[PDB]
UniProtKB/Swiss-Prot annotation, chain D:
Alphabetical UniProt keywords: Mitochondrion, Ribonucleoprotein, Ribosomal protein, Transit peptide
GO MF annotations, alphabetized: RNA binding; structural constituent of ribosome
TM ranges: none
Protein's recorded name: Large ribosomal subunit protein mL43
Assembly behavior: Component of the mitochondrial large ribosomal subunit (mt-LSU). Mature mammalian 55S mitochondrial ribosomes consist of a small (28S) and a large (39S) subunit. The 28S small subunit contains a 12S ribosomal RNA (12S mt-rRNA) and 30 different proteins. The 39S large subunit contains a 16S rRNA (16S mt-rRNA), a copy of mitochondrial valine transfer RNA (mt-tRNA(Val)), which plays an integral structural role, and 52 different proteins.
Organism: Homo sapiens (Human)
Shown chain mapped onto the complete sequence: 2 to 149 of 215
One cellular-component annotation, GO: mitochondrial large ribosomal subunit
From Swiss-Prot, chain F:
Lineage, opening ranks: Eukaryota, Metazoa, Chordata, Craniata, Vertebrata
Annotated InterPro entries: Ribosomal_bL17 (IPR000456), Ribosomal_bL17_sf (IPR036373)
Family designation: Belongs to the bacterial ribosomal protein bL17 family.
Coiled-coil boundaries: none
PANTHER family assigned to the protein according to its UniProt record, in alphabetical order: LARGE RIBOSOMAL SUBUNIT PROTEIN BL17M (PTHR14413:SF16), RIBOSOMAL PROTEIN L17 (PTHR14413)
Keywords (A to Z) from UniProt: Mitochondrion, Ribonucleoprotein, Ribosomal protein, Transit peptide
Keyword set includes Ribonucleoprotein: yes
Protein name in the entry: Large ribosomal subunit protein bL17m
Curated annotation (Swiss-Prot), chain G:
Sample GO molecular function, one term: nucleotide binding
Protein name: Large ribosomal subunit protein mL39
Keywords (A to Z) from UniProt: Acetylation, Leigh syndrome, Mitochondrion, Primary mitochondrial disease, Ribonucleoprotein, Ribosomal protein
Tissue specificity note: Isoform 1 is ubiquitously expressed. Isoform 2 is heart-specific.
Disease annotated for this entry: Combined oxidative phosphorylation deficiency 59: An autosomal recessive mitochondrial disease presenting with multisystem manifestations of variable severity. The disease spectrum ranges from lethal infantile Leigh syndrome to a milder disorder characterized by hypertrophic cardiomyopathy, lactic acidosis, attention deficit-hyperactivity disorder, and survival into adulthood.
Family of this protein: Belongs to the mitochondrion-specific ribosomal protein mL39 family.
Curated annotation (Swiss-Prot), chain H:
Protein species of origin: Homo sapiens
GO biological process, one term: mitochondrial translation
PTM text: MRPL32 precursor is processed by the m-AAA protease (composed of AFG3L2 and SPG7), which cleaves the N-terminal transit peptide. Cleavage by the m-AAA protease takes place prior to assembly into the large subunit, an essential step for mitochondrial ribosome (mitoribosome) assembly. Proper processing by the m-AAA protease is dependent on the zinc-binding region within the tightly folded C-terminal domain of MRPL32: zinc-dependent folding halts degradation initiated from the N-terminus and triggers the release of mature MRPL32.
Chain residue ranges for the region called Disordered: 86-108
Protein name as catalogued: Large ribosomal subunit protein bL32m
Summary of the function given for this chain in its UniProt record: Component of the mitochondrial large ribosomal subunit (mt-LSU). The mitochondrial ribosome (mitoribosome) is a large ribonucleoprotein complex responsible for the synthesis of proteins inside mitochondria.
Entry GO MF terms: RNA binding; structural constituent of ribosome
Span of the signal peptide: none
Chain intervals with Basic and acidic residues compositional bias: 91-103
Residues represented out of the complete protein: 79 to 186 of 188
Source species taxonomy: Eukaryota, Metazoa, Chordata, Craniata, Vertebrata
Length: 39, 300, 57, 148, 166, 152, 266, 108
């Protein structure tokens, strides 16, 4: 279901099959959950 | 898969279920034994460019066969068991047809396969080889294909797996000469010496190296047929055949340029026992094959 | 309209008042686009658009 | 070192520039030491500059702890809640005065990357640009390759 | 030396009010000095994390590993302490929440090579911690379906503003 | 390569493995129960099958006598064998030895099993008792069979 | 107004539960005994107005909670989610037993109740006829043409109800409240009257499944998750329905399932 | 042959954390109808096996006590009894070997 689902999502959004996969906890924690509110 | 069936059955329902399964399979086979009686779709005549459906027999063993000229010729054995059509699909690049073979128990199979084989008659088969057939010959699913489909004096190709030798070394996998026994080897007798050059710090893809030998489908072209059997539905093909004994093999028409326009005398669609066709003898022989029981040869 | 049945459309729904458009606004879907157009029309009617006057201090 | 340091967009605490101007500096607590050579500047300030600084802007209250301290510090609170506890160890009177003036002039906003020195609330006046701009419209809006 | 897992069992919380949740009881227990490695202990811990205590014991009773019996005994002792000291009625309503395994105090020995050399032979010791929380085990985080991916993509595309300008 | 190869190598050669199998067979004939690895268990079971066959062939037969004298090192189990395990199973044909399985060894963790001759005086083993006939699926199958029988 | 009727029935059920629970004497404890085949002679000191054999199963191990279906107290059958009274022996029943007849009857009754609930939620009932287990199909007459689409919709509804996973709340209530809850359908009224006349008193057992309530006799399956497979064979003649279902831990096979369906199609 | 670059902690973790190396969970643990000691499929129980082993050991000890010295192996069958229980009329010549014990709830 992983491969077929990713292929369907890519064909629907016309994007690559690389950004669909998740990332490790390193990048998850490096992400800022409280960004600076602008405007 | 899930939980095997033989888990919640007492010591009295196992044989009853076995007998019921056998009776149902036999009844389905007997009901499907009549293809012409049921809607067989319009049958077309032979054409220059058109192929026919193949068979999927079992490689039993091997035996010799002497011709009228007095020469030994190895011959294989191919038992055509059931061999029914599953479905039909039109335009890919050309029409296609699925064919089965042996009768495998319907207990260790997927639910989707079980439903697909329940939509049609017959029990689930083992393998399913798709043949690239033309739009001319189009047989309806559920029809049988005995050994009578082929006839002597015809080149039929065969393809199947091979006796896999597992992850073998180098010599047995590619035939390398290895290294000598002495003068002055100490630990080099079957290993691969140099890879390829020196400055190249890579390895040429596809280079001969240790790997899993055999266990792959390989087709053989140019195999003449000598004799065929109608009672047991056996096909005797010249030369060896890939795959071990009691192994399913895919058989179909040849493809060489010298053997392409010669199916005029052969049945364009498939042999039909029900006829209106004049049954054939016990076994059709060849023009250059010593029949069993004929007088001794004489080159005088 | 941009695209169509591509899961990422962009329709520019308008509001013709006797062959005289009073406002308009884009939106993801058709109903959302019409709602945004009606909201922009109400804004223009109330003079609350971004082109209003700042203030008088 | 911006990637390894938090940032914040430029903005005000209450838009004081529009209406009345409110002093962002709240209070100031000086921890001067009576006996000690590490607070002569703070002492001279509290003596002959703190009064003038307080009278120049009555919208700020200042305290004088005057406790046995080894290092004089200054707590500069703000309305938003930020606190700038700086130290004035060994500093001339002019330096301390300039530091106090700078603290009173600045706001409680953090001292990090300001990013984009401009906060335009309504940057679009003639209509924000969109892909469907500076383009015509055919008859009946017939997309290309359309018969009826 | 640093013993803390044994001291955490003495934490005391204030009395809860009627309008408050049940607060699942936490358990702490560990055995010190275990003649065993640490990688295998961590493997066993990872194997026994989301499962309950019954399934954990069932898997341990059929795990061809020296540490299996040690972990089973530790879990049995923890369950007994929870049913006796920590005051818990349900014996099967406990699931594993945390499980680690750090090295201990190692010694040193000699191996004697085939020449005038040698190498230090440390006596690898390890430990084992377990945290059993009251109540049934939580369900495993299911895999995000295509709808979740589409929603995340739409949110990422909608939460984008112009760059390098006003 | 080992395509269609029988006799799993155990000891340091054919002699060692056959001697071990003979010792296991002697121990089983003496006690009627041995805990050995699965491989050795099945090998000794297959050997005891032919041993019982030879014992059933006859006692006066010189071939069977020599086989019993060879495969039995103690030399005291030949009469017990010939006079107990041959007449007792005078009705059976190939229903000897009942193989099962042991959880594992507490030392090196090895797959062990148990084999014994049927009808022994020792206590019975916990054989895998199939599900009773009064269950749901069993009752449904019985009803289906009754309906099929009444259909005629 | 079926929604209002169901709401009133649920309100009456909740009021009856509150009335039954109000008589608790500040939680009175008792010492119940357990006489089983494994791990004797264990006992339990549970409650007498709230505790259920499920609590004893949990105290023992999760295996019993996942396998136990009925608890035999004094030789009589009981439910897993039902308050017990009078300290007596306790037992456990599963599908793989020596005489699992009570479990089979309970499963049949639960399947009949689920079929009735699905029929009611589809788009008047009469009762729950107790058909033997050997019949190979549970029946549930309903007073009011079905096709393959209707059967598929009923099967989908049953699968959704099973996936919902809800407990079976039981109550031993007199005939007065039973008639008050069913003061519309005359068939159910007559059934309740007959059940009350059969018993020495007016006590009658009830059942509740979220927004569905029905009267029966023997116990049922606690959770609906125990029912793995579920199908609807066909309909016969006021209209008698049919169906087959297999529980968890006894997953037969697609072929056996189709054979059982064909056998039930009668 | 020697390591040219030490493997990083990330590489080591990725190597020692893949599902191929992790212990594969098993789902072949049922409940034994006898003594409920959670047995495994296609495998005998534990407590029952221990009881059978103890009984066989006791029977062998009794046989040795009755047989005496080694190198015997009589050519007669055996019959096990218990407290009381008159010998079966069918097995009269078979040597009886027993001492003192009560028939359990699982022996015929
Ligand atoms: Mg050579
Ligand atoms: Mg050499
Ligand atoms: Mg070896
Ligand atoms: Zn047991």
């Amino acid at each position: 279901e992983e491969g077929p689902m990713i292929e369907q999502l890519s064909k629907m959004f016309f994007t690559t099959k690389h950004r669909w996969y998740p990332h490790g906890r390193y990048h998850r924690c490096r992400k800022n959950l409280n960004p600076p509110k602008d405007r | 898969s899930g939980t095997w069936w033989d888990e919640h059955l007492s010591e009295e329902n196992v044989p009853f279920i076995k007998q019921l399964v056998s009776d149902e399979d036999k009844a389905q086979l007997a009901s499907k034994l009549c293809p012409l009686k049921d809607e067989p779709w319009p049958i077309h005549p032979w054409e220059p460019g058109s192929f026919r459906v193949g068979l999927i027999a079992l490689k039993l063993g091997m035996m010799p066969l002497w011709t009228k000229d007095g020469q030994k010729h190895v011959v294989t054995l191919l038992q055509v068991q059931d061999c029914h059509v599953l479905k039909y699909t039109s335009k890919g690049k050309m029409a296609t047809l699925s064919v089965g073979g042996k009768t495998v128990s319907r207990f260790r199979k997927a639910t989707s396969i079980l439903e697909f084989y329940r939509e049609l008659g017959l029990p689930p088969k083992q393998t399913v080889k798709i043949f690239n057939i033309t739009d001319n010959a189009a047989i309806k699913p559920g029809t049988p294909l005995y050994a009578a489909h082929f006839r002597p004096g015809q080149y039929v190709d065969v393809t199947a797996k091979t006796i896999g030798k597992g992850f073998q070394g180098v010599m047995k996998r590619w035939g390398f000469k290895g290294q000598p026994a002495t003068h002055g080897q100490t630990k080099t007798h079957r290993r691969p010496g140099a890879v390829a050059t020196g400055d190249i710090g890579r390895v040429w893809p596809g280079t001969k190296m240790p790997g899993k030998m055999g266990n792959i489908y390989r087709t053989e072209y140019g195999l003449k047929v000598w004799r065929i059997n109608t009672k047991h539905n056996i096909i005797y093909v010249n030369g060896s055949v890939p795959g071990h004994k009691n192994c399913l093999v895919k058989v179909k028409d040849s493809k060489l340029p010298a053997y392409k326009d010669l199916g005029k005398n052969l049945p364009f669609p498939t042999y039909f026992p029900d006829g209106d066709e004049e049954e054939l003898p016990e076994d059709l022989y060849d023009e250059n094959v010593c029949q069993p029981g004929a007088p001794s040869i004489t080159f005088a | 309209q941009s695209g169509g049945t591509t899961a990422l459309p962009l329709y520019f729904v308008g509001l013709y008042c006797d062959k005289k458009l009073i406002a308009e606004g884009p939106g993801e879907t058709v109903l959302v686009a019409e709602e945004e157009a009606a909201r922009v029309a109400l804004r223009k009617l109330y003079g609350f658009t971004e082109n209003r006057r700042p203030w008088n201090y | 070192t911006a990637r390894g340091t938090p940032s914040r967009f430029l903005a005000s605490v209450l838009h004081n520039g529009l209406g009345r101007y409110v002093q962002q500096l709240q209070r100031l607590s000086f921890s001067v030491s009576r006996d000690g050579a590490s607070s002569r500047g703070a002492r001279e300030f509290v003596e002959r500059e703190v009064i003038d600084f307080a009278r120049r802007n009555p919208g700020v209250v200042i305290y004088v702890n005057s406790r046995p301290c080894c290092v004089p510090r200054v707590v500069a609170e703000y309305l938003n809640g930020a606190v700038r506890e700086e130290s004035i160890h060994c500093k001339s009177v002019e330096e301390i005065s300039t530091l106090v003036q700078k603290l009173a002039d600045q706001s409680g906003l953090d001292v990090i990357r300001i990013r984009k020195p401009f906060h335009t609330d309504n940057p679009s006046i003639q209509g924000q640009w969109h892909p469907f701009t500076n383009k015509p419209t055919t008859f009946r809006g017939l997309r290309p390759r359309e018969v009826q | 030396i640093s013993r803390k897992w044994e001291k955490k069992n003495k934490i005391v919380y204030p009395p809860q009010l009627p309008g408050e949740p049940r607060r699942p009881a936490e358990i702490y227990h560990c055995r010190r000095q275990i003649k065993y490695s640490k990688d295998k202990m961590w493997y066993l811990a990872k194997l026994i994390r989301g499962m309950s205590i019954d399934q954990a014991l069932a898997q341990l009773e059929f795990n061809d590993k020296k540490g299996a019996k040690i972990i089973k005994e530790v879990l049995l002792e923890a369950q007994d302490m929870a049913v006796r000291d920590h005051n818990v009625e349900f014996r099967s309503n406990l699931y594993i929440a945390e499980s680690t395994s750090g090295r201990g105090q190692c010694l040193k020995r000699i191996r004697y090579h085939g020449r005038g050399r040698f190498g230090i032979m440390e006596k690898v010791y390890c430990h084992y911690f377990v945290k059993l929380v009251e109540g049934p085990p939580p369900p495993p985080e299911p895999p995000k379906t295509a709808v979740a991916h589409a929603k995340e993509y739409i949110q990422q595309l909608r939460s984008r503003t112009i760059v390098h300008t006003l | 390569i080992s395509h269609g190869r029988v006799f799993r190598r155990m000891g340091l050669g054919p002699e060692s493995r056959i001697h071990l199998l003979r010792n296991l067979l002697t121990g089983l004939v003496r006690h009627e129960r041995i805990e050995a690895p699965w491989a050795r268990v099945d090998e000794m079971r297959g050997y005891a099958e032919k041993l019982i066959d030879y014992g059933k062939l006859g006692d006066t037969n010189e071939r069977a006598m020599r086989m019993a004298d060879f495969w039995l090192t103690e030399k005291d189990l030949i009469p017990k064998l010939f006079q107990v395990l041959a007449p007792r199973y005078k009705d059976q044909t190939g229903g000897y030895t009942r193989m099962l399985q042991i959880p594992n060894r507490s030392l090196d963790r090895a797959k062990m099993a148990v084999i014994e001759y049927k009808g022994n005086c020792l206590p019975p083993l916990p054989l895998p008792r199939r599900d009773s006939h009064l269950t749901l699926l069993n009752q449904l199958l019985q009803g289906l069979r009754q309906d099929l029988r009444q259909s005629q | 107004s079926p929604t209002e009727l169901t709401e009133m029935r649920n309100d009456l059920f909740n009021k009856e539960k509150a009335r039954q629970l109000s008589l608790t004497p500040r939680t009175e404890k008792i010492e119940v005994k357990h006489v089983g085949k494994t791990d004797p002679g264990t006992v339990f000191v549970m409650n007498k107005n709230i505790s259920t054999p499920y609590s004893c199963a949990m105290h023992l191990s999760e295996w019993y909670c996942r396998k136990s279906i009925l608890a035999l107290v004094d030789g009589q059958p009981w439910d897993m989610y039902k308050p017990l009274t009078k300290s007596c022996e306790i037992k456990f029943l599963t599908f793989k037993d020596c005489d699992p007849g009570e479990v089979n009857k309970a499963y049949w009754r639960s399947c009949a109740m689920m079929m009735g609930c699905v029929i009611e939620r589809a788009f008047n009932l009469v009762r729950a006829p107790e058909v033997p287990v050997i019949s190979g199909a549970f029946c549930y007459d309903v007073v009011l043409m079905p096709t393959k689409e209707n059967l598929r919709s009923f099967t989908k509804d049953a699968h959704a109800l099973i996936y919902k996973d809800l407990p079976f709340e039981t109550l031993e209530v007199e005939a007065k409240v039973a008639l008050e809850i069913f003061q519309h359908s005359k068939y159910k009224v007559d059934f309740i009257e007959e059940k009350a006349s059969q018993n020495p008193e007016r006590i009658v057992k009830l059942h509740r499944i979220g927004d569905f309530i029905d009267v029966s006799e023997g116990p049922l399956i606690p959770r609906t998750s125990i029912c793995f497979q579920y199908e609807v064979s066909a309909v016969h003649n006021i209209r008698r329905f049919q169906g087959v279902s297999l529980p968890v831990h006894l997953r037969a096979h697609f072929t056996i399932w189709d054979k059982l369906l064909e056998r039930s199609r009668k | 042959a020697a390591p040219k670059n030490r493997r990083t902690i990330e590489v080591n973790r990725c190597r020692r954390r893949n599902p191929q190396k992790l212990i594969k969970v098993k789902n072949n643990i049922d409940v034994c109808p006898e003594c409920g000691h959670l047995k495994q499929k296609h495998v005998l129980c534990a407590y029952c096996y221990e009881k059978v082993c103890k009984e066989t050991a006791e029977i062998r000890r009794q046989i040795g006590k009755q047989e005496g010295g080694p190198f015997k192996a009589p050519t007669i069958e055996t019959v096990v009894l218990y407290t009381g229980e008159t010998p079966s009329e069918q097995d009269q010549g078979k040597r009886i070997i027993e001492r003192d014990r009560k028939r359990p709830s699982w022996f015929t």
